[PDB]
């Protein structure tokens, strides 16, 4: 329906973890299908991690 | 006045717009007058400076305002003419408050968020709720949709404003439907209620409480998940509504009616709706859904566009094509074609994709070249127009498609191989499409030819004139900044083309048509913005009829 | 606050953020940090 990977739940989870006092050093993104470069860039920009700190594991 | 607030769960593509439009449809079927206010917590004044990828296709109103596609959905489902005040952004509220503070309305106290920004938001909502929108109709229910999800930094002022607003107008006049997502991952295999519980916890911490929980999934969720949501959201079993992905959005009002939403809202908001009279209320939507289910004949239209990576970037165009396909009892097979892959540069890089897209274009009954901005993909549109004109394939170009058609005609028939648009090639020997002088003041955003205009039919038999109903002039909405150049106009007209659409001044050409070719129509305005489920846009209807070789029969 | 929001709205109305959604975290905070950088120096 939406037809695109959504990064908002991960942003909210990172915000909650930081408000709890912990800043992620890696972020593992679980998806059914591989996400594009722009999705990882959005994750890095809005969850405030480097582009290489966003690990993307899909349904192997 | 009664209010329904539709908030978002974990994502912003969950379906709040469709849920709000279905609320409006259900209430207007009963007999009420429904207003719709879209709240966009972004700081942009309007949606005219948005890419189609950001949130979908940009909608243009009668007064020129460029807004979200949610307002397009509201107009399509409710058949109402919205205004600029029906969209509330953060930028609008802050600009209003800053202007008031500068003038001196707030003299004496500092201007804050909670006492001033939220007060301005509540004043805006109350004032625009009462503004007539369908004529002399005085609204009874206002459906406010909050863009985004609960928990965003931009949405905190609006959530606090509505937390105060529910007590300002009493709870009997205020309801809240929360729309959430229930993901079902393949690895886990089970619907997950945790994000909905998190959303409800956040919305309760913010001071509100969902009267309804609308759970969105791809497939119907089992009763265990629904009961878990009812248990962990402190709402009753019958206050959780499960809406899955349906074949069309005409099924959403029917599904919500089957779920007892109308009765719950009548009891919760004291709407005093009578059930005995409200029988066969949604007959139009039931008929439309049945027709969408039972269409067998196939019509294939190739959309040669540049924003095909996101399918909602052409939402209004797809809806107009669907309306035209249903108006002639045809099933619409829509094949999006990236115009970049049709260019010769793609041939030397991805020959497989080049030939695949070209055989996609050659196997369709009709071609549609939509509008757009920038120079990327323009050559693909010109190549598609050339193929359509050479092979007698019907083509309907919109805005940027008219410029591409004019450029192709000048380059091929007139021999001007350097013909181009100033938007793309400012240093052009033969500038076939030039910029309009009064829309290039260096201030992007609300500075084009926006909204309803007047287009005059030329003196001469044209089938596009007959499609509209043999009028003398028509009023259509524009969103363009560049125009066709007069002398080239003249030359081309002489050659093989007929500029059959102009304005009152008879200088700005809007509609072109070709002698010979069965259907080659290009317009400067957007016909999709005025398309309604029972009122298909005449250009799209003509394109469909020419594609299925039924235009001549429809003429007589 | 008023200065920052007025500055961002005026920038957006000209086309400095052409094509993107102007938000708080990427844009208001960037304006605040750019203000601090240009004033401190
Ligand atoms: O669509 P509506 O009806 O709610 O109308 C909407 C949807 C969204 N917004 C605003 O846009 C920003 C980010 O949007 P957004 O939710 O898309 O987050 P993101 O960073 O793009 O992550 P993701 O990949 O999950 O999309 C936020 O400030 C919000 C507005 O004002 N109205
Ligand atoms: N390029 C352009 N965009 C405008 C203009 N006026 C309003 N807008 C809007 C439409 C565009 O979607 C948005 C610009 O963002 P983008 O550059 O990402 O869209 P565009 O269609 O140009 O795609 P592209 O740049 O070729 O990748 O601003 C204009 O005069 N030129
Ligand atoms: N119940 C449903 N079944 C199938 N598709 C749906 C649906 N509800 C919405 N959609 C489609 C239509 C929209 O283009 C897209 C979501 O956009 P939307 O309805 O405007 O939601 P939002 O306002 O949250 O962005 O998904
Ligand atoms: Mg949306
Ligand atoms: Mg919406
Ligand atoms: Mg987004
Ligand atoms: Mg651009």
Domain termination residue (choose one: B290, B317, B339): B290
Distance CA B344, CA B380 (A): 9
Q: How many domains does chain B have?
A: 2
Whether residue B286 is found in the same domain as residue B296: no
Count CA atoms within 13 Å of residue B135 on its CB side: 2
Question: B408: CA distance to ligand 6 center in Å?
Answer: 36
Whether residue B131 is found in the same domain as residue B265: yes
Alpha helices in B139-260 (DSSP H): 156-168, 194-205, 223-232, 251-258
Whether residue B331 is found in the same domain as residue B247: no
**Pair of tokens at residue B424:** 């793309």
Distance CA B197, CA B218 (A): 19
DSSP string, B30-73: HT--EEEEEEE-SS-SSSTTB-HHHHSPPEE-TTS-EE-HHHHH
Q: What letter does residue B437 receive in the DSSP assignment?
A: G
* Dihedral (CA of C24, B57, B65, B479) sign: positive
Q: How many residues does chain C have?
A: 41
To which residue do tokens 């700190």 refer?
A53
Residue pair B244/B10 in contact (Cβ under 8 Å)? The answer is no
Largest CA distance in chain A: 36
**Pair of tokens at residue B335:** 């094949």
Distance CA B543, CA B311 (A): 21
B398, β-bridge pairs: B523
Ion ligand 7: residue ranges with CB closer than 5 A: B 374
**Domain containing B145 — which CATH number?**
3.40.50.300
Residue pair B495/B478 in contact (Cβ under 8 Å)? The answer is no
SS3 content of chain B, % helix, strand, coil (to 5): 40, 20, 40
Q: Which residue, B95, B35, B46, is CA-closest to B68?
A: B46
Which ligand is nearest to the Cα of residue C21, counting in written order?
1
**Pair of tokens at residue B117:** 């920004």
On the 0-12 / 13-18 / 19+ scale of CB atoms within 10 A, A9 is middle
Q: Which residue, B525, B545, B4, is CA-closest to B269?
A: B4
With a 6 Å cutoff on the Cβ, whether A1 touches ligand 3 is: yes
Whether residue B345 is found in the same domain as residue B284: no
Whether residue B6 is found in the same domain as residue B57: yes
To which residue do tokens 């540069």 refer?
B345
Specified resolution (Å): 2.8
Whether residue B340 is found in the same domain as residue B269: no
Whether residue B16 is found in the same domain as residue B56: yes
Q: Where are the beta strands (DSSP E) in B318-378?
A: 331-338, 366-369
Alpha helices in C1-41 (DSSP H): 2-12, 29-40
Q: What letter does residue C17 receive in the DSSP assignment?
A: T
β-pairing, B473-474 with B455-457?
Answer: antiparallel
Q: Residue B352: helix, strand or coil by DSSP?
A: helix
* CA B497 to chain CA mean position, Å: 32
Whether residue B265 is found in the same domain as residue B300: no
To which residue do tokens 């972004």 refer?
B42
Instruction: Return the axis-axis angle of helices B283-293 and B251-258, rounded to nearest 10°.
Output: 120
**Domain containing B419 — which CATH number?**
3.40.50.880
Distance CA B245, CA B252 (A): 9
Whether residue B439 is found in the same domain as residue B493: yes
**Pair of tokens at residue B131:** 């503004």
Q: Which residue, B220, B288, B227, is CA-closest to B253?
A: B288
Whether residue B183 is found in the same domain as residue B296: no
Residue pair B98/B91 in contact (Cβ under 8 Å)? The answer is no
Which member of B116, B399, B476, B517 is catalytic?
A: B399
Please tell me the distance in Å from B265's CA to the nearest CA on chain C.
34
B292 phi/psi in degrees, rounded to 5? -65, -30
**Pair of tokens at residue B215:** 């759970």
Q: Which residue, C8, A5, C35, is CA-closest to B42?
A: C8
> Could you tell me the residue range of the domain that residue B42 belongs to?
2-290
Indicate yes or no: CB of A4 within 8 angstroms of CB of B13: yes
Question: Would you give the end-to-end CA distance of chain B in angstroms?
Answer: 51
B43 phi/psi in degrees, rounded to 5? -95, -10
Q: Which residue, B180, B152, B327, B151, is CA-closest to B242?
A: B180
Distance CA B113, CA B105 (A): 16
H-helix or E-strand spanning residue B432: strand B430-435
Whether residue B454 is found in the same domain as residue B436: yes
Distance CA C4, CA B94 (A): 11
Residue pair B91/C22 in contact (Cβ under 8 Å)? The answer is yes
Residue pair B213/B180 in contact (Cβ under 8 Å)? The answer is yes
B143, β-bridge pairs: B4, B36
B59, β-bridge pairs: B67
Domain termination residue (choose one: B273, B290, B307): B290
To which residue do tokens 């953020």 refer?
C17
Whether residue B337 is found in the same domain as residue B278: no
**Pair of tokens at residue B225:** 């998940």
Residue pair B43/C8 in contact (Cβ under 8 Å)? The answer is yes
Q: Give chain C positions within 8 Å (CB) of B45.
A: 9, 12-13
* Dihedral (CA of B343, B344, B348, B354) sign: positive
User: What's the angle, vertex CA B214, arms to CA B71 and CA B90, rounded to 5?
Assistant: 40
Domain termination residue (choose one: B240, B274, B290): B290
Residue pair B365/B547 in contact (Cβ under 8 Å)? The answer is yes
Q: Give chain A positions within 8 Å (CB) of B310.
A: 3-4
Radius of gyration, CA atoms only, chain A: 11
Q: Which residue, B180, B191, B104, is CA-closest to B149?
A: B180
B495, β-bridge pairs: none
Residue pair B231/B224 in contact (Cβ under 8 Å)? The answer is no
Question: Which residues contact ligand 2 via a Cβ below 6 A?
Answer: B 48-49, 51-52, 372-374, 376, 444, 481; C 18-19
Distance CA B468, CA B539 (A): 8
């Amino acid at each position: 329906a939406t037809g695109e990977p959504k990064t908002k739940p991960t942003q909210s989870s990172v915000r909650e973890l930081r408000g709890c006092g912990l800043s992620p050093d890696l972020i593992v993104c679980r998806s059914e299908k591989p996400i594009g470069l722009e999705v990882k860039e959005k994750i890095s920009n809005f969850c405030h991690v480097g582009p290489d700190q966003v690990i993307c594991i899909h349904d192997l």
